[PDB]
Amino acid sequence: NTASIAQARKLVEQLKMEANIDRIKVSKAAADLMAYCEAHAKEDPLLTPVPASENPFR
Amino acid sequence: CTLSAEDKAAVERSKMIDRNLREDGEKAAREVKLLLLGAGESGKNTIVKQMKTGIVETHFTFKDLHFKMFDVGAQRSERKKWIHCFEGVTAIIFCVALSDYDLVLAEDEEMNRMHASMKLFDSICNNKWFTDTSIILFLNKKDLFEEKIKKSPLTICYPEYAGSNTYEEAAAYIQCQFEDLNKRKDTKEIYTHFTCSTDTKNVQFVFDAVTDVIIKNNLKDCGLF
Amino acid sequence: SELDQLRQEAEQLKNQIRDARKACADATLSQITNNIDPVGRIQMRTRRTLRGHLAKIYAMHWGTDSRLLVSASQDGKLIIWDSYTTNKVHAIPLRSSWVMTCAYAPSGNYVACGGLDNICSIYNLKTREGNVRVSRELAGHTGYLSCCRFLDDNQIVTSSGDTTCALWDIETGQQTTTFTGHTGDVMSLSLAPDTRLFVSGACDASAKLWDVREGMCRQTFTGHESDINAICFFPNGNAFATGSDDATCRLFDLRADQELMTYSHDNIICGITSVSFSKSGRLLLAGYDDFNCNVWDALKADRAGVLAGHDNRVSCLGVTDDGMAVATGSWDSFLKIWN
Amino acid sequence: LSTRVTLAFFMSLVAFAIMLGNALVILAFVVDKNLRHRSSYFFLNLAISDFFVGVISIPLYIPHTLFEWDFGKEICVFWLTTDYLLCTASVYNIVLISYDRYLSVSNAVSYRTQHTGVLKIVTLMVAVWVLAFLVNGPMILVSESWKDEGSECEPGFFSEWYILAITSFLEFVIPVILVAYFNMNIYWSLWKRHVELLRARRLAKSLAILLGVFAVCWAPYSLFTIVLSFYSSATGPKSVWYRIAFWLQWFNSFVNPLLYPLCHKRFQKAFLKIFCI
Amino acid sequence: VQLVESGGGLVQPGGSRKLSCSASGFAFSSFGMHWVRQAPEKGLEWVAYISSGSGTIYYADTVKGRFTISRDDPKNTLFLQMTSLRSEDTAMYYCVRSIYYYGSSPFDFWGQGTTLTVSASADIVMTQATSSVPVTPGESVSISCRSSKSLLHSNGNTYLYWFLQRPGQSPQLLIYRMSNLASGVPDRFSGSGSGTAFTLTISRLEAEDVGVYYCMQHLEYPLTFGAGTKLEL
Ligand SMILES: NCCc1c[nH]cn1
C-alpha cells in the first residue's frame, strides 16, 4: 500500500515545515491585541462607544 | 409625505417584490417534498425511473399533486451537517434491495450489507430532525430475491431466523425486521411496499401514503388526535 | 517497516512542535488583561426588523458601504436589503434552493452563493438590462458548498463539504489553486484584511492557515473537542476566533501559534453557529443554537451582554465595516439589526 | 339585596372571562401573519361573535335582572336582537369550522391545491352573520306579534309555539345534525384509513366532546321555551331552572375559544410568542 | 437596449393622435417610463410619467386632462394618447426609461423620439447661467446653473441631473445626483454644487462634447429642465 506511504511522507514533510516557523512569546502577542483595542477604542467602535447621535438606524 | 420623489418609487419596488415572494411561497406550500434515500444497488434507480453534482431534483405531477423528489444518495459528506436542511419534508422514501441478504458490504470486514441498510434506516428514522416525518419503505428486487433464496438460505443474514426459505415468509420477516426499528411508533408511521423492475404501482402507493399523511397532519394540527 | 517509521517520525515532529509552542507560553492573555478596565454591561436594541423570507436563513453578509446586505434562505430567493429604509433592492431567484452560503463582492458589483449543489454561482448586479443575471457557475467541488468570500471582482475563495478548498478565477472559471489537508468537512473560512492569508475550520476540530499565492499550509491549530463551524479574523489580522459544537469559542494567535483565551459558560449547552468581531476587536459576538447571541469581552472573556429576539437557531451574524450595527439571521426567516 | 351582590359579582366574572379569552384569540390573529389560513379566519369570526356577548349582552343584563333596572322599549329591542344575533352566529361559525375540517379530511388533495382568495373567505364570514340575523332578527323587529304592558323582554313570538319551534329548528336542530354528520365522517376517514387503537379512541373522544358541549348548552333552553310555549305563553314569572338554561347558552361562549383555537397548534405557538416572551 | 418611438405626424388643431414606443434589449417591466418633448427651439420639458406596474402616474399642468399615458408590459410597449392638440404641442417627443432603487441611475437611456406638428405654481425653476459658451478643443469649460429651491434633501442626496444632446442626436445622461458619473461617460465630466447653485466641469474638451447641456431637478414632480447651454465650437 504505497498510497499510505506517500501520505505519511507528505504528512512528515508538512510537519517539518510547521516546526520551522518562528514563534513569539504569548505575552508579546497578548500585549499587541490589547494595544490595538485601546488605540481604536475611543472612537472607532460604536458598539462599545454608543453614538448618541449620527446613528443611521435611529 | 416626508420622502423624496425617488424614495417613494423604491418603496413601490419593494412592495412589488414583497408581492411576488408571497405568491411563490403560496405555490411551494401546495407541493409535496419527498426525501429519497437508499443504499448501493438498492433499486433506487428503478424507483426513480418508474416514478419519472450533489442533490438531484425530480419533479412530476400525479392526480393534481405536484411532487418534488430530493435524491441525496450521491452526497458523500457528513450527513449530520446537511440532513437538517430537509427538516419539514412531507415524507421519506427508503429503498432496500432484498437480494442483499447474501451480499457483504464494500468493507467485507463489517456486517452484511442488509445490516448496513438497516443501520442507516435506524439512523435516519430515530433522528431528532424527523421525529414527525413518516417514512415510505420500498423493498426492491423481490423477483430476484425469490430466486436466490432457493439457492442460499436467508439465515446468512439473520442467523436467528427459524422459519422457511419461502418467498412470503422471508419477505414478511424482513419487513418485520425493518419495521421494528421504529423507536417512536407513537408519532411516526411506516408504509412498506414491495416493488420490482416491471411494476408500475409505486406512484399510486406514494400518492395514497401522502394523502394519508396529509390527512393525519391536518387532524393533528387541529388538536383532535 | 517504513510505515511505522514515518508514523513515529510524524509523532516525534508533533511532540517537537508542541514543546516549541509550550516554550512560548510564559503567560495567559487573562494575566495581561487583568489591569484593563471591564467593558461593562452591553446594551443593544432591535433597530430594524426585515421580513419577507419564508424558510430557514443560513447565510448573510454585509456590503462595503455598511448599508447594503445580502441574505440567503432555502426558499430559493436571495434578497438585497437597504438596511436604512428596509426597501428591497433586488430579489434573485435561485436555481438551487438548498444554498448555505452567500457573499457580497467588495466592489458591490457581484454576489455569490451555493450549497448542496456543489456549485458557486456568481450574479452580476450592474447589468445594462436592469436585472440580475448569472455571470458564471463555478463547478469542481465533490461536496456541498460551505462558505465563499470574494478576493476581487475576478477571484473568489470557496470551501465545501469535501475537505478541499479552492481559489477560483471567475473569468476563466477554473480552480487557480487547491488546498488540501483537512480530514473533515470544511465549514467556514475567513479572509485576512490584506487578502493574502485566510483560515478555514473543519469538522476535524482543527484550523489551518493558508497562503493564497503559494498554496501551502503554514500553521495548523487545534484545541476544540468537536466540529468547528464558525471562524473570523481579528481586525488587525494577527488572530482569529473559532466556534464549535462543543459550546466553547477559542481565540488563536498566528505569530504565537497558540490558544490565548477560551469563551464558554456552564449554562451554554449548545454549539456555535457564527462568530464576528467589532471594529475595535474588543467585543466578540457569537451565534448560538439557543435562540440568542452572547457578546464576549475578547480581552477579559466576560459575557458582557446577550442579544435575543429570534424564535429559532441563529444561523449567521455580521458587523458593518464601520461598526455602527450588527445584523443577525435565524431559521425563523427573520433578519434583525442591533445597535 | 343580600343575595344579589354575590350574584352580580359572579355574573360580571363570567362576562369578563368570556371577553378576555376571545380578545386573546383576536390579539394573536393580528400579531401573527402565519395565522392567515382559512381556519384562522373562521376562528376569528367565532371570537368576534363571542366577545360581544361578553361586553354588550351579559352586562346590560345584570342590573335589569337583579336590580330590576328599568328597560327602555328601544333598549329592549337592541338587547334582544343583538343577543340573538351573536348567539346564532356562534352556532353557525361552529358549523363552518366543522365543514372545513370535513373538507380537509374528505378531499385532501383538492383542499391543499385549491387556493382561496380572501374574497371567498370574507364572503363566507359575512354570510354567517347575515343568516344569523335573518333567522331570528327580523321577527324581533317586525312580525313581532306585539306584546302589551312591557312583558319583560321576551322576543314576543314566544306566545306562539309553532314559530318558536321553526326558529329552533333553523338555529339548533339543523346545525346539530350537520355537526354530527361532519364529525362522524371525520372519524370514519381515519378509522377505515395498540397505537392505532389509542389514537382512534382519542379522536372519538374529541369529536364527541365538541358535539356534546354544543348540545348540552343549547338544547335545554331551546326545548324549555317550546315546551312552555305549548302549555303556557312562556312569558312572565319563570322557574329557577328556566334561568339556569338561559345561562347555559351564554356559557358556550367561554368554552368555544378554548376548544377551537387553543387546540389548534398554530395558535398555541403564537400565544407563546406573545405571552412567554 | 433601444427605444423606438413612432406615431408622429401632421395633425389638425384640436385633433387627436396616439404615439407608441417599443422597448427591446432590457426588462421593460422593471423600468419606469417618461415622456419628454422638445419644441422646435432647443429646450426640454417633462410631459408625463408612469411607474413600474401602472400604480403611479403623473402629468404636467400643461397637458394634464388632455393627454393620457399607458403601457403594455406583456408586449413591452408604451403609449401616449393626445386630445385637443394646441399649437404649442408641436415638439419631438422622447421616451426615457427610469428605474428607482438604491444606487440606480434614472434617465440613463433616451430614445430617438418622433416629431409631431400641429397645423395653424410652486414649480422649481431651473435657470442656467449662460446660453452659449464659445470654446475650442483643449481647454476646460465650466457650466453653471441655479435652482429656485434647495434640491439637497434631508436624506443627503442632491437631486440634480445633467444631460447632453449632441447635434442631431438624443440627450445622454452625464451625471446624476450631482455626484455620480453615469456609465460609459469619460472622466472629463465632473460636477458639484452648494445646494442652490451647481456647476458642470468638462476637462480636455474633445470634438464630441459640443451641444446643449440641460440641467434637470428630480426633487419633486413636476420635473423642470434648464434653458440649455450650447457649447459651440
Ligand atoms: N339566544 C339568546 C337567548 C339566550 C338564552 N340564554 C342566553 N341567551
Q: What DSSP letter does each residue of D156-194 carry, written as one string?
A: S-TT-HHHHHHHHIIIIIHHHHHHHHHHHHHHHHHHH--
Phi, psi of D6 (to 5 degrees): -65, -40
The answer to whether the CB atoms of B185 and D195 lie below 8 A apart is yes
Q: How many domains does chain D have?
A: 1
**Residue from the list E51, E159, E221 with its beta carbon closest to the beta carbon of B12:** E51
- C-alpha–C-alpha distance, residues E151 and C12, integer Å: 73
Angle made by CA atoms C122, C127, C132, in degrees to the nearest 5: 50
Atom of ligand 1 minimally distant from the CA of D87: 1
Q: How many domains does chain E have?
A: 2
The technique is cryo-EM
Q: Which residue of E has its CA nearest to B19?
A: E53
Residue C232 CB partners (closer than 8 Å, separation 6+): C190, C240, C241, C275, C276, C277
Q: Grid coordinates in use for E84?
A: 385637443
β-strand B91-97 against B31-38: which pairing, if any?
A: parallel
Do chain B and D touch: 3 or more Cβ pairs under 8 angstroms? yes
Residues C146 and C100 sit within 8 Å (Cβ to Cβ): yes
Residue D120 class from Cβ within 10 Å (0-12 exposed, 13-18 middle, 19+ buried)?
exposed
Chain B residues contacting E via beta carbons under 8 Å: 2, 4-10, 12-13, 16
Q: Residue D199: its chain B contacts at CB < 8 A?
A: 225
Q: How far is the CA of D55 from the centre of ligand 1 (A)?
A: 15
Q: Grid coordinates in use for C56?
A: 430557514
- C-alpha–C-alpha distance, residues E120 and D118, integer Å: 56
- C-alpha–C-alpha distance, residues C154 and E116, integer Å: 49
Nearest to B39 by CA among B109, B158, B141: B141
Residue E57 CB partners (closer than 8 Å, separation 6+): E48, E49, E50, E51, E69
Q: Which chains sit next to D, with 3 or more Cβ pairs under 8 A?
A: B
Residues C16 and C249 sit within 8 Å (Cβ to Cβ): no
Q: Grid coordinates in use for D11?
A: 355574573
- DSSP helix/strand/coil, C27: coil
Task: Return the CATH number at E110.
Answer: 2.60.40.10
SS (H, E, C) D215-249: HHHHHHHHHHHHHHHHHCCCCCCCCHHHHHHHHHH
Task: Return the CATH number at B142.
Answer: 3.40.50.300
CA distances from E30 to A34, E35, E76, E102, E172 (A): 51, 17, 11, 14, 20
Residues C146 and C101 sit within 8 Å (Cβ to Cβ): yes
Q: Are residues E112 and E131 in the same domain?
A: no
Task: Return the CATH number at A12.
Answer: 4.10.260.10
Q: Computed from CA positions of residues D252, D257, D262, D264, in that sequence, does the dihedral angle turn out positive or negative?
A: positive
Residues B184 and B131 sit within 8 Å (Cβ to Cβ): yes
Answer whether residue B183 is part of any domain: yes
Q: Are residues E94 and E146 in the same domain?
A: no
Q: Computed from CA positions of residues C106, C109, C115, C119, in that sequence, does the dihedral angle turn out positive or negative?
A: negative
Q: Could you identify the residue written with the cell 423624496?
A: B4
β-strand B134-140 against B91-97: which pairing, if any?
A: parallel
β-strand C314-319 against C326-330: which pairing, if any?
A: antiparallel
CA distances from E12 to D12, E56, E83, E117 (A): 80, 31, 11, 9
- C-alpha–C-alpha distance, residues B206 and B94, integer Å: 12
Residues E32 and E48 sit within 8 Å (Cβ to Cβ): no
Q: How many domains does chain A have?
A: 1
CA dihedral C300, C302, C307, C308 (to 10 degrees): 160
Q: Are residues E148 and E97 in the same domain?
A: no
- C-alpha–C-alpha distance, residues E131 and E126, integer Å: 13
Answer whether residue B224 is part of any domain: no
Nearest to E198 by CA among E154, E230, E229, E233: E229
**Residue from the list C67, C283, C326 with its beta carbon closest to the beta carbon of A48:** C283
Answer whether residue B93 is part of any domain: yes
Q: Angle at which helices D174-192 and B202-221 pack, to 10 degrees?
A: 130
- C-alpha–C-alpha distance, residues C234 and B186, integer Å: 50
Nearest to E233 by CA among E205, E202, E203: E205
- C-alpha–C-alpha distance, residues E149 and E154, integer Å: 14
Residue B147 class from Cβ within 10 Å (0-12 exposed, 13-18 middle, 19+ buried)?
exposed
Residues C120 and C143 sit within 8 Å (Cβ to Cβ): no
Q: Are residues E145 and E225 in the same domain?
A: yes
The answer to whether the CB atoms of A8 and C7 lie below 8 A apart is yes
Parent domain of A27: 4-54
- C-alpha–C-alpha distance, residues E192 and E170, integer Å: 24
**Residue from the list C3, C7, C13 with its beta carbon closest to the beta carbon of A16:** C13
Nearest to C201 by CA among C228, C241, C163, C239: C228
Q: Grid coordinates in use for A18?
A: 510547521
**Cβ of residue D221 lying under 6 Å from some atom of ligand 1:** yes
- C-alpha–C-alpha distance, residues C277 and D109, integer Å: 50
DSSP 8-class letter at D55: I
Residues E111 and E95 sit within 8 Å (Cβ to Cβ): yes
E29 touches chain C (CB under 8 A): no
Q: Could you identify the residue written with the cell 520551522?
A: A20
CB neighbours (10 Å) of residue B201?
11
The amino acid that residue E197 corresponds to is A
Q: Residue D111: its chain B contacts at CB < 8 A?
A: 218
- DSSP helix/strand/coil, D149: coil
CA dihedral D100, D105, D108, D112 (to 10 degrees): 40
Residues D150 and B61 sit within 8 Å (Cβ to Cβ): no
Q: Which residue of B has its CA nearest to C138?
A: B53
Q: Are residues E114 and E144 in the same domain?
A: no
Nearest to D43 by CA among D76, D82, D9, D90: D90
- C-alpha–C-alpha distance, residues D222 and D217, integer Å: 10
Give 3-state DSSP helix, strand, coil % of chain A, rounded to 5.
Answer: 60, 0, 40
- C-alpha–C-alpha distance, residues B94 and B102, integer Å: 20
The answer to whether the CB atoms of C130 and E27 lie below 8 A apart is yes
- C-alpha–C-alpha distance, residues C287 and C258, integer Å: 24
Angle made by CA atoms E178, E180, E185, in degrees to the nearest 5: 110
Answer whether residue B152 is part of any domain: yes
Parent domain of D257: 2-275
- Of E65, E87, E118, which closes a domain? E118
**Cβ of residue D246 lying under 6 Å from some atom of ligand 1:** yes
- C-alpha–C-alpha distance, residues E213 and E229, integer Å: 5
**Residue from the list C16, C234, C322 with its beta carbon closest to the beta carbon of A33:** C234
CA C17 to chain centre: 27
Distance from the Cα of C179 to chain B's closest Cα (Å) equals: 17
- C-alpha–C-alpha distance, residues D39 and B223, integer Å: 13
Q: Residue A44: its chain C contacts at CB < 8 A?
A: 279-280, 323
Distance from the Cα of B88 to chain D's closest Cα (Å) equals: 15
Q: How far is the CA of B224 from the centre of ligand 1 (A)?
A: 29
Query: Ligand 1, from D65, D91, D250, D253: best to mutate by most atoms within 8 Å of Cβ?
Result: D250
The amino acid that residue B85 corresponds to is C
Q: Are residues E97 and E163 in the same domain?
A: no
- C-alpha–C-alpha distance, residues B21 and C90, integer Å: 12
- C-alpha–C-alpha distance, residues D226 and D228, integer Å: 5
The answer to whether the CB atoms of A26 and C28 lie below 8 A apart is yes
- Closest-CA residue, ligand 1 atom 6, reads D246
Query: Ligand 1, from D53, D76, D77, D83: best to mutate by most atoms within 8 Å of Cβ?
Result: D83
CB neighbours (10 Å) of residue C312?
14
Nearest to D3 by CA among D65, D63, D66: D66
Task: Return the CATH number at D240.
Answer: 1.20.1070.10
Distance in angstroms between the alpha carbons of the first and the last residue of chain D: 45
**Edge-to-edge strand list for the sheet holding C155-160:** C145-150, C155-160, C165-169, C174-179
Q: Angle at which helices B113-125 and B167-179 pack, to 10 degrees?
A: 40
Parent domain of E204: 126-231
Parent domain of B110: 32-216
Q: Which residue of A has its CA nearest to C297?
A: A48
**Edge-to-edge strand list for the sheet holding E189-193:** E126-128, E141-147, E197-202, E189-193
Phi, psi of E118 (to 5 degrees): -115, 125
The amino acid that residue C156 corresponds to is I
Phi, psi of B60 (to 5 degrees): -160, 165
Residues E151 and E159 sit within 8 Å (Cβ to Cβ): yes
Classify the phi-psi angles of E160: left when phi > 0, otherwise alpha if psi is within -120 to 50, otherwise beta.
Answer: beta
Query: Bridge partners of E91?
Result: E116
The answer to whether the CB atoms of B9 and E51 lie below 8 A apart is yes
Instruction: Report the run of H or E that residue B23 belongs to, with start and end.
Output: helix B7-28
Q: Grid coordinates in use for B125?
A: 428514522
Q: Residue C68: its chain E contacts at CB < 8 A?
A: 102
Tell me the resolution in Å: 2.6
CA dihedral D155, D161, D163, D169 (to 10 degrees): 100
D11 touches chain B (CB under 8 A): no
Domains in chain C with CATH codes = 1-339 (2.130.10.10)
Q: Grid coordinates in use for E160?
A: 440634480
DSSP 8-class letter at D258: I
